[PDB]
Design an enzyme around this catalytic site. Structure first.
Site, PDB file in Angstrom:
ATOM      1  N   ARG C  13       0.836  -1.193   0.000  1.00 34.26           N
ATOM      2  CA  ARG C  13       0.000   0.000   0.000  1.00 34.26           C
ATOM      3  C   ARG C  13       0.881   1.257   0.000  1.00 34.26           C
ATOM      4  O   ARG C  13       1.771   1.359  -0.851  1.00 34.26           O
ATOM      5  CB  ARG C  13      -1.006  -0.102   1.153  1.00 34.26           C
ATOM      6  CG  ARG C  13      -2.038  -1.208   0.948  1.00 34.26           C
ATOM      7  CD  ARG C  13      -2.802  -1.597   2.218  1.00 34.26           C
ATOM      8  NE  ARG C  13      -3.447  -0.439   2.852  1.00 34.26           N
ATOM      9  CZ  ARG C  13      -4.619   0.065   2.512  1.00 34.26           C
ATOM     10  NH1 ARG C  13      -5.326  -0.474   1.530  1.00 34.26           N
ATOM     11  NH2 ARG C  13      -5.086   1.144   3.149  1.00 34.26           N
ATOM     12  N   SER C 136      16.486  14.023   6.976  1.00 34.97           N
ATOM     13  CA  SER C 136      15.108  14.405   7.266  1.00 34.97           C
ATOM     14  C   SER C 136      14.270  13.201   7.638  1.00 34.97           C
ATOM     15  O   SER C 136      14.659  12.043   7.385  1.00 34.97           O
ATOM     16  CB  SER C 136      14.453  15.191   6.124  1.00 34.97           C
ATOM     17  OG  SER C 136      13.898  14.426   5.065  1.00 34.97           O
ATOM     18  N   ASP C 142      -2.536  12.738   9.110  1.00 36.24           N
ATOM     19  CA  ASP C 142      -3.917  12.513   8.650  1.00 36.24           C
ATOM     20  C   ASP C 142      -4.599  13.868   8.466  1.00 36.24           C
ATOM     21  O   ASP C 142      -4.728  14.650   9.404  1.00 36.24           O
ATOM     22  CB  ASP C 142      -4.650  11.609   9.617  1.00 36.24           C
ATOM     23  CG  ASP C 142      -6.060  11.225   9.143  1.00 36.24           C
ATOM     24  OD1 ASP C 142      -6.683  11.971   8.310  1.00 36.24           O
ATOM     25  OD2 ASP C 142      -6.537  10.170   9.611  1.00 36.24           O
ATOM     26  N   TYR C 155      -7.132   6.399  17.733  1.00 36.06           N
ATOM     27  CA  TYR C 155      -6.432   6.595  16.449  1.00 36.06           C
ATOM     28  C   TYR C 155      -6.206   8.071  16.298  1.00 36.06           C
ATOM     29  O   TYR C 155      -5.076   8.524  16.007  1.00 36.06           O
ATOM     30  CB  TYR C 155      -7.262   6.007  15.252  1.00 36.06           C
ATOM     31  CG  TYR C 155      -6.720   6.458  13.901  1.00 36.06           C
ATOM     32  CD1 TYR C 155      -5.548   5.911  13.381  1.00 36.06           C
ATOM     33  CD2 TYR C 155      -7.272   7.535  13.240  1.00 36.06           C
ATOM     34  CE1 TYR C 155      -5.037   6.341  12.164  1.00 36.06           C
ATOM     35  CE2 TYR C 155      -6.766   7.997  12.049  1.00 36.06           C
ATOM     36  CZ  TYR C 155      -5.655   7.397  11.511  1.00 36.06           C
ATOM     37  OH  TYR C 155      -5.128   7.871  10.354  1.00 36.06           O
ATOM     38  N   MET C 157      -6.185  10.455  18.586  1.00 34.69           N
ATOM     39  CA  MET C 157      -5.221  10.914  19.616  1.00 34.69           C
ATOM     40  C   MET C 157      -3.787  10.646  19.139  1.00 34.69           C
ATOM     41  O   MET C 157      -2.890  11.497  19.266  1.00 34.69           O
ATOM     42  CB  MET C 157      -5.522  10.242  20.948  1.00 34.69           C
ATOM     43  CG  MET C 157      -6.796  10.760  21.628  1.00 34.69           C
ATOM     44  SD  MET C 157      -7.368   9.647  22.929  1.00 34.69           S
ATOM     45  CE  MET C 157      -6.062   9.832  24.110  1.00 34.69           C
ATOM     46  N   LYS C 159      -2.658  10.276  16.017  1.00 31.80           N
ATOM     47  CA  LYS C 159      -2.294  11.155  14.883  1.00 31.80           C
ATOM     48  C   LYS C 159      -2.109  12.590  15.311  1.00 31.80           C
ATOM     49  O   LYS C 159      -1.224  13.279  14.806  1.00 31.80           O
ATOM     50  CB  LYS C 159      -3.286  11.079  13.750  1.00 31.80           C
ATOM     51  CG  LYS C 159      -3.228   9.748  13.040  1.00 31.80           C
ATOM     52  CD  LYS C 159      -1.873   9.490  12.379  1.00 31.80           C
ATOM     53  CE  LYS C 159      -1.968   8.356  11.380  1.00 31.80           C
ATOM     54  NZ  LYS C 159      -0.680   7.924  10.800  1.00 31.80           N
TER      55      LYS C 159
END
Ligand SMILES: NC(=O)c1ccc[n+]([C@@H]2O[C@H](COP(=O)([O-])OP(=O)(O)OC[C@H]3O[C@@H](n4cnc5c(N)ncnc54)[C@H](OP(=O)(O)O)[C@@H]3O)[C@@H](O)[C@H]2O)c1
Ligand SMILES: NC(=O)c1ccc[n+]([C@@H]2O[C@H](COP(=O)([O-])OP(=O)(O)OC[C@H]3O[C@@H](n4cnc5c(N)ncnc54)[C@H](OP(=O)(O)O)[C@@H]3O)[C@@H](O)[C@H]2O)c1
Ligand SMILES: NC(=O)c1ccc[n+]([C@@H]2O[C@H](COP(=O)([O-])OP(=O)(O)OC[C@H]3O[C@@H](n4cnc5c(N)ncnc54)[C@H](OP(=O)(O)O)[C@@H]3O)[C@@H](O)[C@H]2O)c1
Ligand SMILES: NC(=O)c1ccc[n+]([C@@H]2O[C@H](COP(=O)([O-])OP(=O)(O)OC[C@H]3O[C@@H](n4cnc5c(N)ncnc54)[C@H](OP(=O)(O)O)[C@@H]3O)[C@@H](O)[C@H]2O)c1
Ligand SMILES: Cc1ccc(/C=C/c2[nH]c3nc(N)nc(N)c3c2C#N)cc1
Ligand SMILES: Cc1ccc(/C=C/c2[nH]c3nc(N)nc(N)c3c2C#N)cc1
Ligand SMILES: Cc1ccc(/C=C/c2[nH]c3nc(N)nc(N)c3c2C#N)cc1
Ligand SMILES: Cc1ccc(/C=C/c2[nH]c3nc(N)nc(N)c3c2C#N)cc1
Lengths: 250, 251, 249, 250
Positions: C13, C136, C142, C155, C157, C159
């Protein structure tokens, strides 16, 4: 056939570096200018020496007035007149000076600061859209410090805030026409010509990444990315190019 | 003696509710209005029946023009002529309508109205307010919670409200030395437009997590009251959403 | 000589696409994986067929635990072992599932969702910096963190904490010349579990083309941020969301 | 019957100011504490002498572990045991210390403490509060400087950012239950007790509004607003109480 870009305030400094890079990338360019006629004509000379018939100048005041819509239409029209198309608009031109709350009238300061930083971008965006294997986009030069503004720059900051709203609203509304709209937000880049060396160094020393201002070319690099095929899913985004300056507390 | 407030666009709806609450709190009020003279005057009469000589009206167009700075100065002056002081400014008056980017009012007029009412007039009123300055001085700007998720085809309105956030922040910083706090209240969906079909109003209402209903004018007024109060004396440059969670809802 | 990059959760992915593009740009890569060994190796096989000895795999659970720090140190070590340098860290691996507030233990959900999305990135960032040119880190954030999916508090929290890491680390590592940035997809590759009709509902919401970002479009922003074209950029999170985050309810 | 509130880390400083104000407004209070038993008891005694049987203490470590969910459930249970209801939850308790990225507690203990207290315990207490259910609300003590953080505080900052996400996620999710979820974000309020006066003054001089830190009472005032019927349409909002500090550039 080569794409074409309009860059406002392109005779000097960051606008110029943006025009040069677009041109190096394959674009034909409209070099908009206000007062900097010599330097505009000189840049078009340089560019056309490299590839004939690929640069033209276009003069216009971008202060707000009842004729600003006509002037902005004419800037876009000038790209179609020279090149038969207009693929990219870069809203770079900008007035910048203090307007404390406590020579020019306040009406003029409003006209200049809000016109150049917000109203003219809006009108250019309208005229760009209206005139429209394509990669159409707009890049607005924003300001990374708009939530931590310089003291006594309320009208300037109001203009740059409005520019963020424009970026978002136009990204949203123009997406169905395949036109992307994004921003690049310098922190400190080329310091004002009128600013003394002591103040310039005060600003440099604030930047975490290198204790130096951005080059014009570093700002241009992010503009180039946003107009490129590597950003075709990117719209309504504003990319800070500030070496971390906006992260630094008082 | 009693403090004094200017509320712009106070004849109706949210501005009216703000003026009433400020008056109930002990403020003398200047009710600024543009076209709604009859409503402005009836509000002033109601308030003066409550306490004599505590409300006046002041008529002005807040469209951007060459005369806006003088108009805004005169609004502030009217509070001083009526009441001897001006403690609170509430920038509430606002033009609101679509201005699509692609195709009676000319665009220059739409710019003048939308940017003048939502941004420039607030700025000029702020200058004038500050130029005239146990005190508790503050400004509250009526912002918009949905400014980062705008309605389609409202670019100029949205530009205006974004500029207003910028003013709230720039003025909070610059006026803090004078003890003048500058804050915002950001409604999401409050009173819907008057002629709007209930079925359209319900589309908006159903989006609101907290109660599937729009905010009352009074709920908006409550947050203004807090910000001007002695309980908010360290609060400056803050914009309080009063939006029932609407701005947290994804598409 | 060629720079080297660590990409977490790189077997499939979006992480796979990032690994492939970095490799195509001339990086040597460490392909990290947790359960997807077959896919990580097949990717390595493909990359090494283009250019010999330029891709290795590295296994680790990135759930928070007593051993997560040592596992993170070893991810960074694996890059120095294979390639003698570590120029780029991409924090991409991520647990993603709902954690309703009202009704795996909850503490396991905390360990996975907060560990993968925030603690492991913090640990990897410490190990990467401790070992230290165009250096870097890119964190996969998100775009919808302020308009979150219903019932995804942990999830979300995680991100959000990753945004904080991006910013704190950009500040703190700037003296070392290490830039720290983010890429924030909106809807890109939808979860494999997600029903088709539900996938189309998300696609319909996107202003720009009514479709999800390909993994490659996400990878394109990563490439820019790690490039010499982004050498003054730190602390920046680039949304790649086709305008999705601009769309009101 | 009087409503009841839980205030975490309420023995001292801002949490005490919150409990006191809620008490003065008519709430019965659970004063949660970790190490500060004597201070917690001294506060509860004062409140009880003002109104009999209106305050109790409740001890718990809010460090993350596998039993933290049980400890958070028990804090909420303690409010129901004492008072028969729980209308308000204030998430104030917080660990705060540097965690430098480049070089004592183990790093995993620093994660457990800084992420536990600032984020995970609020999340678990929110679940428990909601499960146990009028003007119901939660107020989370946030940090106005999370986008301009202190150098070497990444884990603390990560925790406060997570707390913003919880505030937003929980406001969305608990709205249909009529539970509002908001935050209050101090910039500089009461400085740490180990900070010397000179260092405090360095911070104070940064604040545009009065060159001084917020009092504990000033923070408490914003909490009391958000729990009140004057904020009954407000959910998912975080009110800065920072005297303009977050607006001041480097
Ligand atoms: N330099 C920085 O550090 C920095 C920081 C943050 C943001 N930015 C943004 O990046 C962009 C470029 O910055 P810069 O420093 O290169 O800009 P600049 O030199 O201050 O302005 C660029 C050009 O804007 C044009 N301009 C000004 N007033 C005008 C008017 N009334 N009508 C038409 N054009 C007008 C001028 O054209 P003529 O010379 O032809 O009159 C000028 O050369 C600006 O949008 C700026 O706000 C820059
Ligand atoms: N209603 C909402 O859901 C909502 C949502 C987000 C933000 N807000 C903001 O909250 C505020 C109050 O909203 P509202 O719905 O109560 O406002 P509104 O009814 O749309 O407008 C308030 C008043 O603005 C005045 N006004 C309009 N154009 C003017 C001009 N050219 N010059 C001077 N005054 C002018 C009008 O005064 P006259 O009537 O006397 O002509 C009008 O009654 C506004 O700032 C608005 O943007 C409201
Ligand atoms: N897809 C989207 O639309 C979207 C939207 C917003 C943000 N993002 C962000 O973009 C990044 C990539 O997204 P994606 O959809 O490609 O991710 P994904 O397929 O959900 O997850 C990527 C990899 O994460 C690894 N991972 C999961 N839990 C782990 C654990 N406990 N320890 C170690 N590794 C673990 C897995 O590796 P193994 O297979 O080897 O177990 C998995 O293949 C993520 O950070 C995501 O949060 C994606
Ligand atoms: N003070 C400021 O300037 C400032 C600035 C920004 C934000 N804030 C926020 O406002 C809130 C209050 O600030 P403050 O300075 O009053 O807080 P504080 O004194 O630093 O901490 C408050 C309480 O947190 C509790 N706590 C610490 N670790 C714990 C653990 N492992 N388990 C359970 N409880 C624990 C302690 O209880 P015991 O004493 O009982 O052990 C302590 O009294 C915090 O959330 C803070 O982050 C404050
Ligand atoms: C704290 C802070 C706030 C604002 C700034 C803005 C910098 C800036 N914006 C400019 N716009 C134009 N048209 N010209 C410029 N020369 C600048 C400029 C600078 N320096 C820089 C730092
Ligand atoms: C997605 C979304 C975006 C913006 C809004 C703002 C609503 C709004 N703003 C207004 N301003 C003025 N002067 N008058 C109004 N009647 C509104 C209004 C509404 N309804 C509501 C929802
Ligand atoms: C409104 C909204 C809120 C959140 C999202 C998140 C999308 C998303 N995040 C992911 N993280 C991981 N590790 N894997 C994924 N498959 C996703 C995913 C999707 N789809 C998308 C839309
Ligand atoms: C630039 C800047 C960044 C962060 C702050 C935060 C101050 C702060 N946060 C705290 N949290 C807890 N649990 N206790 C504290 N004493 C503080 C505190 C201070 N002072 C203050 C200034």
């Amino acid at each position: 056939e080569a794409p074409a870009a309009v860059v406002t305030g392109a005779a000097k400094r960051i606008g110029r570096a943006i025009a040069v890079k677009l041109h190096q990338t394959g674009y034909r360019v409209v070099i908009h200018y206000h007062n900097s006629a010599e330097a505009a004509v000189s840049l078009a000379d340089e560019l056309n020496k490299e590839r004939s018939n690929t640069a033209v100048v276009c003069q216009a005041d971008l202060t707000n007035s009842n004729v600003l819509p006509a002037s902005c239409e004419e800037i876009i029209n000038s790209c179609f007149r020279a090149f038969g198309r207009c693929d990219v608009l870069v809203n770079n031109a900008s007035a910048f000076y203090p307007t404390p709350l406590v020579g020019k009238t306040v009406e003029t300061q409003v006209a200049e600061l809000i016109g150049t930083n917000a109203i003219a971008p809006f009108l250019l965006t309208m005229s760009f859209a209206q005139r429209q294997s394509s990669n159409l986009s707009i890049v607005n030069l924003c300001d990374a410090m708009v939530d931590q503004p310089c003291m006594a720059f309320s009208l300037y900051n109001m203009g740059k805030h409005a520019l963020v709203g424009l970026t978002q609203s136009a990204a949203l509304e123009l997406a169905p026409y395949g036109i992307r709209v994004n921003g690049v937000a310098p922190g400190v880049s080329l310091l004002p010509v009128a600013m003394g060396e002591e103040e310039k160094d005060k600003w440099r020393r604030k930047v975490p990444l290198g204790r130096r201002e951005a080059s014009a070319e570093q700002i241009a690099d992010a503009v180039i990315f946003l107009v490129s095929g590597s950003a075709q899913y990117i719209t309504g985004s504003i990319i800070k190019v500030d070496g971390g300056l906006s992260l630094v507390h008082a």
